[PDB]
């Protein structure tokens, strides 16, 4: 939840752009599946602990 006080990177950019987070369970998606071994978005479901 409170990863707002922390800058987070998977590439050179911080993760902050809402394109770089995408959630998608149980639906047909190749944009999800071209992302396998890709860091350009980071895929996370219900990203609060």
């Amino acid at each position: 939840r409170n990863a707002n006080l922390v800058r987070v990177v998977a590439d050179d950019v911080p993760l902050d752009a809402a394109h770089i987070e995408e959630r998608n369970p149980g639906t047909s998606d190749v944009a999800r599946m071209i992302a396998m071994d890709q860091a350009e978005p980071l895929f996370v479901d219900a990203r609060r602990t």
């Binding site: 987070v8 990177v9 998977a10 911080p14 993760l15 396998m36 071994d37 890709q38 980071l42």
Partner: protein, 49 residues
């Protein structure tokens, strides 16, 4: 897939005082979509990283 996630974080503002202290990004390096290892799986050792 097992895409890891570098954290560029600062400290708490009570430690943040001083030219080493301020102007310092701590570096976690976490493993996202990752799983611990007891022992090496012998059969899936090809598709394991």
């Amino acid at each position: 897939n097992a895409q890891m996630l570098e954290i560029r974080a600062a400290l708490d503002p009570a430690q943040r005082h001083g030219a080493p202290s301020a102007g310092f990004e701590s570096l976690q390096h976490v493993l996202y979509n990752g799983f611990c290892m007891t022992t090496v799986p012998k059969l899936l050792q090809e598709y394991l990283t």
